[PDB]
Amino acid sequence: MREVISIHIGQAGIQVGNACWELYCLEHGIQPDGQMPDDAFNTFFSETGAGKHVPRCIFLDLEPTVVDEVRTGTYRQLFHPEQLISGKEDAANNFARGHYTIGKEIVDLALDRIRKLADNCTGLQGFLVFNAVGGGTGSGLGSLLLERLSVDYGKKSKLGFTVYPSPQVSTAVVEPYNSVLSTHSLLEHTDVAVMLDNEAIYDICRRSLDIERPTYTNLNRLIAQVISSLTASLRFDGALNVDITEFQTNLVPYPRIHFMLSSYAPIISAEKAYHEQLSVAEITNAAFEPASMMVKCDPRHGKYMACCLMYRGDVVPKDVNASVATIKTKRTIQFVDWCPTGFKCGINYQPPTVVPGGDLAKVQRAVCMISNSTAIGEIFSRLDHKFDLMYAKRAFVHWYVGEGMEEGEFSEAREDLAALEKDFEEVGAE
């Protein structure tokens, strides 16, 4: 009735999907084999003749290794064998490779399975595309799939949880290139794009979790908790029910400005747990702290446009109202003049479930703050010169040209990002 189709593209998409689906299985009581010992799973799972629950997800990749890890792992009997789609040749961090030459047949098969999955849903709230902006599979194939979905499905709300390059630390060299290309691609195709930065999540793990050696599994666990907190209102009832379709209506002041910071609170280990009050006001303040943001971007630089809060657990409308009133009265947090309210509070009666073997503690309250703010143009300013600095020398441009791209396409993407910078400045302005 409230079905949402999940897509995971690229290594990062599939690896955060592992955490997300582990989290949903733990939340709904679904064993990894597929079945559990009302109808709260329908948003993510469809039950078959044997009673087995299969997730409405699609693991897409041009590289076979990442998908075969799932085919061999504990979640081999849960996912559908044809839902796991594997390519033959990796995109090799080439947007052209993942969008123009290799990705064609794979995305055609992807649309085939997506149509099969959508025909299994009475309603369809929308799509949750989890990819990695900064790689050929993540950028190119994800952009192509988003384009195809926009063409055919039409009105389905597509939420892209994109992982963008960190400011200074990075693992790819053409990462600014394919990041700018994918940003141009999804500026018009996704409905709500959520920014995530590995450096910021690493800082969160280092300070809040006291993990001196964070890794991708830890990062994906935090991301999975954020996404589950986002979708909790679809699967569990609570005061001030929040909806996928109304994320837009309460969050996107203008269609271009749909990139969103995310921040989780509390982020505390077991040893530091039950040591502080962790009240609603304190956790809201922590969520609005710059350190808790999962993107390396100071919120104090820009002005918030909208803030949607998803509370999980024992939260009362008085507590959320008082916390938001204190936040509004606070002088450091600055909102735009044209949005006097700028707040969308929604509570859920289901506390966040804790994945065994993880570092997050069992907290009776949790906040996922997703904010549309003009400060995010600052990371775009970072990528916009990381792009053009190499583009002056046309470094690695032949690699992209070889698979059917043009200098005009890079220029158009960079120009579109400059237009986005202008847009951010204007919307921040009065």
Partner: protein, 431 residues
């Protein structure tokens, strides 16, 4: 399921490839008789990348060994791991190229190249999907360099989109092993620039320095140098054969390494290289691996990175490690040695992580540096080639094999062009 076709050329290439196949069989748990004995599942998951299934449980390397003399591969076949290779993959003549690139590329290698390509096609067509070819050989030798360049040209013609990886042992600076090393190197560099997509540069004297200083061996025979080279050669493709936390195939490395098409030469190194004395005293940690990685002595190439600037650098780590640790270490390296890193590339590190370290090391790392330092090596080859070419010394042999004089001048012109490219990008300023 992305297969790699291995090719060995010349005496040096054949010996290095034999050591490499011994190393890879050890990594995959394959005994010299071909049976799998690894008792380990990830070893057999991607065994098809290098080996093919025989009638029994035997596995045969997808390797093609070439030569113009029979002695080298008689020794190779009689070696410890000689029985794995298919005897049909031994393509060799009767008269060797007398360290003559012209002989190995025009006169004697040309008749054998038909059989070589026949075997190459037979091995490649059996592959489901082909990542590409890797050719191990030595610049500065007749049969090796000549037939290697010819085969690379032919395979480039046949499979333009497939990856080409080369491991060339460039002649050492201070001591020269064969007299016509500058001619052979100059002619082979010309072919490698034009044809080979990715090329690894190795030096025997640099290997001697590293194995006497870091490893501290007393009498390192060629087997030890070949073991180092094989370690690097395995580590470069371990991300294909094993699951990785952040995996990177050969094409990903090529894309993230090569800024401009002709600047595809790299200097490589392997870490952690420890002397047996200080194995206990060292701490096997990611910062230690990075520090040893970025040392100039750890570079297997004669050129030291300090004179040049790193255009790009990939580091393929292996083992259960923190990606935050790795990324922070490489960012710290770039910030500390910003003078040695090119300004107009915001990030000069391509970090890859594989979850399966080599047997014996909890953590390991192979480093692949594209730096302008190789400029001085090409310059030294220029200084030797021009010195001999002024007086036409030893040139009449290449003339008598049916090669124009202008082929030499074209080869050295292209190699000087590559030199000046490296200089221009070394001193290129942003904006």
């Amino acid at each position: 399921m992305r297969e790699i076709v291995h090719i060995q050329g010349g005496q040096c290439g054949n010996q290095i490839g034999a050591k490499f196949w011994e190393v890879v069989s050890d990594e995959h748990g394959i005994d010299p008789t071909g049976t799998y004995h690894g008792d380990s599942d990830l070893q057999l998951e991607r065994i098809n990348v290098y080996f093919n299934e025989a009638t029994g449980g035997r596995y045969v390397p997808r390797a093609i060994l070439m030569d113009l003399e029979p002695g080298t591969m008689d020794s190779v076949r009689s070696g410890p791991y000689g029985q794995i290779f298919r005897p049909d993959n031994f393509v060799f003549g009767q008269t060797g190229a007398g360290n003559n690139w012209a002989k190995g590329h025009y006169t004697e290698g040309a008749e054998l190249i038909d059989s070589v390509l026949d075997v190459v096609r037979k091995e490649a067509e059996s592959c489901d999907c082909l990542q590409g070819f890797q050719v191990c050989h030595s610049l500065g030798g007749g049969t090796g360099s000549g037939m290697g360049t010819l085969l690379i040209s032919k395979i480039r013609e046949e499979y333009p989109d497939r990856m080409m990886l080369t491991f060339s042992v460039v002649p050492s600076p201070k001591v020269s092993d064969t007299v016509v090393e500058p001619y052979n190197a100059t002619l082979s560099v010309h072919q490698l620039v034009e044809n080979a997509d990715e090329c690894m540069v190795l030096d025997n004297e640099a290997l001697y320095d590293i194995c006497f200083r870091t490893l501290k061996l007393t009498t390192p025979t060629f087997g030890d140098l070949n073991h180092l080279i094989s370690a690097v050669m395995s580590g470069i493709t371990c991300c294909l054969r094993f699951p990785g936390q952040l995996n990177a195939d050969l094409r990903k490395l090529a894309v993230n390494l090569i800024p401009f098409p002709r600047l595809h030469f790299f200097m490589v190194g392997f870490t952690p290289l420890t002397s047996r004395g200080s194995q206990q005293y060292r701490a096997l940690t990611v910062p230690e691996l990075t520090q040893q990685m970025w040392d100039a002595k750890n570079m297997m190439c004669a050129a030291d990175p300090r004179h040049g600037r790193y255009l790009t650098a990939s580091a393929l780590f292996r083992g259960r490690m923190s990606t935050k640790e790795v990324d922070e270490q490489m960012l710290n390296v770039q910030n500390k040695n910003s003078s040695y890193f090119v300004e107009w590339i915001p990030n000069n590190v391509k970090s890859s992580v594989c979850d399966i370290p080599p047997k014996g090391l909890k953590m390991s790392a192979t480093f692949i540096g594209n730096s302008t330092a190789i400029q001085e090596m090409f310059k030294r080859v220029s200084e030797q080639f021009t010195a001999m070419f002024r007086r036409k010394a030893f040139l009449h042999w290449y003339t008598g094999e049916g090669m124009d004089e202008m082929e030499f001048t074209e080869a050295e012109s292209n190699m000087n062009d590559l030199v000046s490219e490296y200089q221009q990008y070394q001193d290129a300023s942003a904006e």
